[PDB]
Every structure is written in C-alpha cells, then in structure tokens.
Amino acid sequence: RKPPKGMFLSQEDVEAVSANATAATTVLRQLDMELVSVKRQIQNIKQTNSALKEKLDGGIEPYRLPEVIQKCNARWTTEEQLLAVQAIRKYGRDFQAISDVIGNKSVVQVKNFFVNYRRRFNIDEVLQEWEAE
Amino acid sequence: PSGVEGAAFQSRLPHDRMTSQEAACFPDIISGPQQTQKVFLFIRNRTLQLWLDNPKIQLTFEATLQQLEAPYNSDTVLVHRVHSYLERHGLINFGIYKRIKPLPTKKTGKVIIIGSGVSGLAAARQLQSFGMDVTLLEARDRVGGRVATFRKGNYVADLGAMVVTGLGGNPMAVVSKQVNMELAKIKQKCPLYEANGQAVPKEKDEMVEQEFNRLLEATSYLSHQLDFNVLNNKPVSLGQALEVVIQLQEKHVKDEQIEHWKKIVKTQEELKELLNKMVNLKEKIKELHQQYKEASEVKPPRDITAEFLVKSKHRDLTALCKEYDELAETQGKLEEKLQELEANPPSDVYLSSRDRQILDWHFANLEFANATPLSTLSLKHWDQDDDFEFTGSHLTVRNGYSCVPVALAEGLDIKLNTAVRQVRYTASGCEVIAVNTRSTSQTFIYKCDAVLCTLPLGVLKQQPPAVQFVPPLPEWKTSAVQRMGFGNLNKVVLCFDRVFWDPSVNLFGHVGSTTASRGELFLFWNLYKAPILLALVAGEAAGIMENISDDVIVGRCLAILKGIFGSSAVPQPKETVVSRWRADPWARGSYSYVAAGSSGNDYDLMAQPITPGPSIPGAPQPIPRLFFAGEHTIRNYPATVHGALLSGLREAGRIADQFLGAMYTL
Numbered sequence: 090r091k092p093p094k095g096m097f098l099s100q101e102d103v104e105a106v107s108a109n110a111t112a113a114t115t116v117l118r119q120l121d122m123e124l125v126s127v128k129r130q131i132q133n134i135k136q137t138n139s140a141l142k143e144k145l146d147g148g149i150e151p152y153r154l155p156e157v158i159q160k161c162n163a164r165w166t167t168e169e170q171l172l173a174v175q176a177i178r179k180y181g182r183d184f185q186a187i188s189d190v191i192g193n194k195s196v197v198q199v200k201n202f203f204v205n206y207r208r209r210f211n212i213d214e215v216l217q218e219w220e221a222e
Numbered sequence: 223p224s225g226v227e228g229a230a231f232q233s234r235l236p237h238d239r240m241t242s243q244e245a246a247c248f249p250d251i252i253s254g255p256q257q258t259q260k261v262f263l264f265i266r267n268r269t270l271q272l273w274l275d276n277p278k279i280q281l282t283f284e285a286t287l288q289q290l291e292a293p294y295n296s297d298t299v300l301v302h303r304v305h306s307y308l309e310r311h312g313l314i315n316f317g318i319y320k321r322i323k324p325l326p327t328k329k330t331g332k333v334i335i336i337g338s339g340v341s342g343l344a345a346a347r348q349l350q351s352f353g354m355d356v357t358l359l360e361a362r363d364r365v366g367g368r369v370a371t372f373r374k375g376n377y378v379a380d381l382g383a384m385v386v387t388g389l390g391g392n393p394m395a396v397v398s399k400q401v402n403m404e405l406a407k408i409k410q411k412c413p414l415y416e417a418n419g420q421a422v423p424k425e426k427d428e429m430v431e432q433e434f435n436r437l438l439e440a441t442s443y444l445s446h447q448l449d450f451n452v453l454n455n456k457p458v459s460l461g462q463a464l465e466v467v468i469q470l471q472e473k474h475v476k477d478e479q480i481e482h483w484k485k486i487v488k489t490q491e492e493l494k495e496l497l498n499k500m501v502n503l504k505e506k507i508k509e510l511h512q513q514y515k516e517a518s519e520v521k522p523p524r525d526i527t528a529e530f531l532v533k534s535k536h537r538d539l540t541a542l543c544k545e546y547d548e549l550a551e552t553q554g555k556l557e558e559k560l561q562e563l564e565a566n567p568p569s570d571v572y573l574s575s576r577d578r579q580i581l582d583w584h585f586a587n588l589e590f591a592n593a594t595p596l597s598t599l600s601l602k603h604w605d606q607d608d609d610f611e612f613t614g615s616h617l618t619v620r621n622g623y624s625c626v627p628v629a630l631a632e633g634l635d636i637k638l639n640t641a642v643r644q645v646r647y648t649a650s651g652c653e654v655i656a657v658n659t660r661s662t663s664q665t666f667i668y669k670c671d672a673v674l675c676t677l678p679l680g681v682l683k684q685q686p687p688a689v690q691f692v693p694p695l696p697e698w699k700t701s702a703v704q705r706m707g708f709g710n711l712n713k714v715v716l717c718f719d720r721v722f723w724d725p726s727v728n729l730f731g732h733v734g735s736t737t738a739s740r741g742e743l744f745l746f747w748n749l750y751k752a753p754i755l756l757a758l759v760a761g762e763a764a765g766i767m768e769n770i771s772d773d774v775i776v777g778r779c780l781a782i783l784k785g786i787f788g789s790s791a792v793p794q795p796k797e798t799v800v801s802r803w804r805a806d807p808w809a810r811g812s813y814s815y816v817a818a819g820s821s822g823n824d825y826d827l828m829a830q831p832i833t834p835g836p837s838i839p840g841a842p843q844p845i846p847r848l849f850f851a852g853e854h855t856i857r858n859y860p861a862t863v864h865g866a867l868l869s870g871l872r873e874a875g876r877i878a879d880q881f882l883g884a885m886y887t888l
C-alpha cells in the first residue's frame with residue numbers, strides 16, 4: 090500500500106524519469122546544475138552580508154546616551170507645560186514619546202494633560218498642524 | 223504442522239480442503255455433503271501419513287485399510303478410491319521403494335521417454351510401477367541431465383543442481399530417506415571482499431543489503447501499486463524497474479539538498495535585509511547624535527524651544543538605539559540558525575561508488591538465483607512461484623546429487639548415447655527417430671503408444687531445430703516456447719591438496735569492480751569433504767565467460783583468492799573443471815525463468831499434451847499422443863530438481879490415466 094520506508098516513488102516522478110531514454114539523466118542534471126546555482130548564489134549573499142557587517146562594525150556604543158531616571162512627579166512646571174505643547178507639535182499623539190520628552194510625567198498625565206489644557210493651548214490647532222506634516 | 227495434517231503439508235496439499243484435482247476425481251464427494259468431504263480428507267491425509275512415515279516400502283491398500291479406524295475403515299471403496307488416486311498421482315509409493323506385489327506379469331502400452339533427467343526418470347519409474355512398458359532415450363552417456371556431479375579421486379563436486387531448498391513439503395525429502403544422500407545444512411554467513419581483497423565492514427555490509435531488500439520491495443510497489451508494468455508498448459523488466467527506483471532515490475537526494483540550501487539562502491537573505499536596516503539605523507543614529515551634541519552646545523540657561531531640542535533629540539536617539547538593539551538581537555538568532563543549517567546537511571549521495579558495487583553483488587546474487595540478467599526478468603511475474611517456497615534450511619548434497627538420478631535409474635530400460643532427432647505422432651501411435659551420438663549415421667526407430675518429452679526448454683528453443691516434430695507443434699505451443707526464458711549459470715571447480723580458507727564458513731563472496739561484471743566469479747562455496755572450492759559465474763558474465771579458456775578462467779579464480787587469502791596461501795589447484803551449459807547441446811542453458819512478457823501461464827501451456835489429428839478424415843478424435851514434462855512445465859515449481867521430479871510424476875499419472883484408464887473416478 091505504501092512504499093517501503095524512505096523509498097520515494099511518486100506517480101508524477103515515475104512518469105517523469107520514464108518519458109524518454111535519457112529523461113532520467115536530464116532531470117538529474119537539471120537538479121545537479123540547479124542546485125549549484127543556489128550554492129553559488131549563497132556565496133554572494135554571504136559575501137554581501139559580510140561586507141555589510143563590516144560597515145556595522147563597532148556597534149553603536151559610542152553613540153549611546155546615559156539613561157535618565159525621572160520620578161513621575163505630580164505637578165506641571167510652566168516649563169513642563171511648554172515642553173509638552175512643543176512635544177505635541179512634534180509628536181502628534183505618541184503619548185509615550187511625549188512622556189519621554191517631558192521626562193517626568195505619566196503617560197496618563199499626558200492624556201491627562203491633553204484634555205485638561207486642550208482649551209488654552211488650542212491643542213486642536215496644534216494637532217492639526219502636526220497632522221498637516 | 224504435525225500428525226496427519228503434517229502429512230498434507232509435507233505433501234504440498236491443504237489439509238482441510240480438497241484440491242482442484244481431487245474435485246475432478248471425486249466430483250461426487252466435493253459436490254457432496256461436508257461431512258463426507260471431511261471423511262475423505264482424513265483418509266487422504268492419513269494415507270499420506272503412513273507412506274510418509276515409512277517411504278522405504280510400498281503402501282498397499284490392505285495395509286492402508288488395516289491401519290484405518292472406523293468410522294473411516296467403514297467405506298472400503300472410498301479408501302480404495304483414495305489410495306489409488308494417491309498412488310496414481312505419485313503422492314505415495316513414488317521414488318525408490320520395496321515392492322510388495324511384484325510386477326504385473328505382462329505389461330500394457332508402450333511409452334518412449336525422451337531424456338533421462340529427473341523428470342524422465344521419475345516418470346519412467348512411475349509408469350513401470352504401473353505395469354507399462356517404458357524405454358528412455360538419452361543423448362548423453364549418463365543419466366541425471368542437469369544433475370551433473372563430478373567425481374575424481376575423492377573429489378566430488380556438482381556442476382549441476384547443488385542445493386535442496388528446504389525439506390518442508392519437498393519430495394526430495396522422501397527421496398533422501400529413500401536414499402543415502404548425505405545432506406549438509408548451509409550456514410548462512412557469507413562474507414564479501416571488494417576487488418582490493420579487503421573484507422567488507424559489517425556495517426556497510428548490512429547497510430547495503432538492507433538497501434537491496436529495500437530496493438526490491440520498491441519494485442514490487444511500482445508493479446502493483448503504480449501498475450508500472452508496460453513502458454512504450456513493451457513489458458517492463460525487473461531490471462528497468464530497479465533502475466527507475468534507484469534513479470528516483472537519487473532524485474530525492476538532490477531534491478532534498480536543494481530544498482535545504484534553499485532554506486539557507488532565504489535565511490541568509492532575510493538576514494541581509496536585516497543588516498541593511500541595521501546599517502541605516504546606525505546612519506541615522508550617527509547623525510542624530512551630532513545634532514544632539516550640537517544642540518547641547520547651546521549652554522543653559524536656555525529658552526524653551528532650545529531646551530526642547532535637546533530633550534526631543536535625546537528621546538529620538540534612545541528610541542533608535544532601542545530599535546537597533548532589537549535587530550542586533552534578531553540578527554544573533556539568524557546567525558545561529560544559519561549556524562545549525564550548515565550543521566545538518568542532508569545526505570550527500572544515494573550511494574557511494576563503493577556503495578553501488580556491493581549492491582551489485584547482491585544483484586549478481588539475484589541473477590544467480592534466477593539464472594538470468596534482471597533485464598530479462600518479468601517485473602510482474604519473476605517471483606510468481608514465491609508462495610510455494612519450502613521450509614527448513616537449505617542443504618547441499620555432500621556425496622554429489624547424481625546419486626539420486628542414479629538411484630532412480632536402477633531398474634529401467636535406458637538407452638544412452640541415443641539422440642532423438644525426430645518425433646512423429648499420429649492417431650495410431652508414434653515413432654521416434656534417434657541416432658547414435660558416437661556415430662551419427664547409425665539410426666534407430668522406436669514405436670510406442672505415447673512419447674513423453676523431457677527435452678529442456680533450451681533444446682526446444684533451438685533454431686534450427688535439434689529435434690523435429692512431425693507434425694510441427696501447434697503455434698500455441700511454440701509461442702510459449704519462444705516466450706519463456708531459459709537462463710544460464712556456470713560453476714568453476716577448484717580442487718586442492720589443502721584447505722586454505724575458513725572451514726567454518728560455507729560460502730563467501732567477491733565483489734566485482736564493474737556493474738557489467740558483477741556476475742564474474744562473484745561467489746565461492748566450500749561444501750565438500752575434500753578441499754574443494756566452487757565458484758559461480760552468474761548474470762551477463764555467464765554467457766560471456768563461456769568463450770574463454772579454462773586456464774584463463776581459472777586464472778582469474780586464483781587471482782581473486784590470492785587477494786583474499788594472501789598470495790603464499792593459495793596453491794595451484796590439483797584438479798579443475800569449468801562448465802558451459804548454454805554451450806551444452808543437450809541443455810542449451812541452465813533453467814527456465816519468467817521472461818518479461820511471459821507469465822506463469824506459459825508454463826501451463828508447456829505441460830498441455832498434444833493430440834494428433836485423425837488418420838482418416840472424419841474419423842473420431844484421438845487420444846493425445848505427445849506429453850511434456852520437465853522443469854519448464856511445472857508452474858509452481860519451475861527450475862528445480864524437485865520441480866522436474868514432480869512434473870515427471872504428474873505426467874506418468876496423466877499417461878496412465880489415459881492408457882490404462884483410471885478406474886477410481888465414479
């Protein structure tokens with residue numbers, strides 16, 4: 090009912106090697122060659138990838154910046170508000186960034202902020218401007 | 223099995239059912255009630271048993287009856303009917319037994335039997351046993367035909383049949399009892415030595431063998447499951463199928479390698495894309511850093527938009543740093559996964575060159591067994607007779623198989639050196655025309671009621687005819703003759719002053735360097751009391767080797783063995799014999815096989831006797847006159863000694879039924 094284990098004999102394959110005297114070798118050569126093409130093609134990318142690796146050398150570690158720890162304080166300095174608005178203008182809704190930039194506000198606070206001062210900072214206007222880019 | 227059922231089995235019959243043959247003789251019974259069937263069977267079985275239990279003496283109806291018990295001793299005709307069936311058809315009181323009722327005083331009918339093979343011999347005894355008048359005619363100066371056993375000094379070696387394939391249900395079993403043939407089991411262990419002369423590591427050995435077996439079933443699979451039995455209008459040989467299967471296995475290997483490396487590139491490519499992304503990030507990061515550096519130049523205390531720059535720029539830069547640290551993460555995995563894939567290449571090849579060659583030996587072996595190139599074997603039918611395999615280990619005849627024919631021949635009218643040339647059969651009877659082998663011109667004519675032909679298929683196949691049929695055989699007969707295959711296989715015999723090989727081991731192989739020469743001296747046997755080494759030439763080699771001096775042939779022989787056992791060890795052989803059966807005029811080969819495009823049914827056609835037309839037109843249909851037996855006539859036991867013998871028993875019964883009438887079928 091089924092080929093012995095790890096013997097592969099397929100209707101399709103069988104017809105295929107059968108079709109002419111040399112068909113057998115034709116198909117084996119196609120693959121022999123075809124495989125070689127992949128092999129070579131690998132080595133390109135290997136080389137290509139290797140070169141990219143060189144460029145990337147040295148990591149980014151020189152360009153890292155010390156982390157800053159910010160206690161997520163309750164109050165807004167006017168400074169803090171001023172940063173926020175600007176943040177909005179640069180950052181749309183990405184409240185995470187915005188909290189990140191202001192550095193000591195909860196992400197809630199920001200949305201917290203957003204509605205809260207929406208009136209007097211014409212945040213609509215700002216937003217729309219930030220939108221227009 | 224054991225007991226009566228053992229006897230059925232040992233007689234190649236189902237213990238619990240009646241055979242087609244029994245049906246023909248006891249049509250009353252088998253259309254009858256089951257109960258009676260059961261009785262019949264037991265009687266038959268019992269009767270078998272008693273013969274089997276002692277086969278050195280005739281088993282008579284009286285004796286048979288004597289030992290039966292009622293209910294069964296109840297019906298004496300049934301017993302007698304059965305006992306006679308068994309007797310006529312050679313199921314009992316066959317071979318060499320002590321006759322209790324000495325021979326019928328005057329004989330009835332006369333039969334001429336062509337060939338003193340085992341087929342002939344067995345029929346002849348059977349017939350004579352039935353009171354017919356029988357003469358045998360043999361071209362050769364000896365009996366036994368293809369049971370040819372060489373004797374010289376205490377050297378003994380069969381050039382012919384050599385092996386008894388199992389005693390379970392084999393007639394030769396009885397004959398063994400009936401004759402002292404010394405039987406020797408054949409220890410299975412056979413070790414192979416590459417052309418270098420180096421043994422083959424147990425590892426490879428088993429690996430390859432198993433592939434071989436693996437490969438065979440495969441063929442079977444194409445044959446039945448994909449019905450791959452015709453290609454381009456012509457039937458498929460087992461050889462083609464093996465090639466196809468092998469190719470396919472090779473294809474698969476390539477196929478899988480491709481897929482593996484393909485998995486790599488894709489992974490390697492996927493990484494490439496990652497790097498780019500990574501390189502740019504570094505680009506942006508680098509630059510962003512500048513900008514932060516610059517903006518942070520503007521020393522506080524600063525207006526807010528300027529404070530903003532620093533902060534925002536700072537955030538953006540850590541963002542990207544985060545983003546990139548991730549990629550460096552990903553990249554690590556990819557690098558490592560590529561690292562594993564180069565670890566686990568799928569298999570490099572289907573078979574090493576060395577690998578192919580051990581495999582070839584296995585194929586030579588198959589070729590030895592079938593006595594033909596697998597190119598010629600029928601894919602669909604080459605093993606058709608596989609079901610009727612005997613049981614028990616194989617054996618050889620330590621004293622030379624010839625003892626059997628010889629034994630059989632004792633008591634019989636045999637004319638040696640008589641070569642049949644023409645067989646004429648007509649309604650009134652037949653005349654057979656023969657010559658003396660020694661001087662062709664001196665001529666004999668034999669007249670008889672029937673001729674039994676045991677000429678080898680090889681001989682039958684000869685063009686132009688070695689034997690002429692008058693009238694010619696019907697096309698149905700002759701086509702079967704063309705279609706069936708007659709193989710070839712040859713032995714070389716080496717006799718030595720001393721054993722220089724392992725006595726523990728019966729046989730060992732040599733592995734040929736070429737596929738074309740897998741046949742050549744591929745296997746060696748030590749079976750005899752003397753120091754004799756026997757070497758097969760099989761496959762396509764057999765045919766070819768036949769055109770080569772014994773000395774050369776022996777050359778290669780010694781070579782091979784020196785290599786295997788070291789050059790100082792291998793003495794020149796005292797006595798050497800080489801065979802060449804396809805050459806032999808009275809054989810023209812070794813044994814039949816199922817050629818591609820034939821089938822078992824051809825075997826049946828060969829056994830069908832021939833009925834001459836009427837002498838005067840519009841006279842009624844005759845009796846048949848010309849009968850065939852021999853190894854190539856028995857579809858379930860072709861190509862063997864037991865097969866021939868069985869065929870012979872068969873035809874004797876058929877003939878006796880015909881010329882003596884069978885008084886047991888009412």
Ligand SMILES: [C]C1=C([C])[C]=C2C(=[C]1)N([C][C]([O])[C]([O])[C]([O])[C]OP([O])(=O)OP([O])(=O)O[C][C]1O[C](N3[C]=NC4=C3N=[C]N=C4[N])[C]([O])[C]1[O])C1=NC(=O)[N]C(=O)C1=N2C(=O)[C][C]C1=[C][C]=C([N]C(=O)[C]2[C][C][C]N2C(=O)O[C]C2=[C][C]=[C][C]=[C]2)[C]=[C]1
Nearest residue numbers: 337339340341361367368383384385642812852853862863
């Ligand atoms: C040749 C040969 C050799 C070399 C070897 C062998 C053989 C062969 N075989 C076979 C036998 O031999 C035969 O068959 C017989 O013998 C037959 O006989 P017959 O038929 O009877 O015939 P012949 O003999 O020929 O006779 C005839 C006569 O005739 C005459 N002539 C001719 N012409 C003429 C005449 N006359 C007159 N006139 C004219 N014209 C002649 O002369 C003669 O005489 C074998 N067998 C056996 O059994 N065994 C053996 O062993 C042998 N061999 C071997 O080694 C091989 C074989 C074989 C094969 C196979 C087998 N098996 C089978 O088949 C099978 C089935 C199922 C199962 N199986 C099995 O199992 O097996 C496998 C095997 C293989 C191998 C081994 C082991 C196992 C068996 C066997």
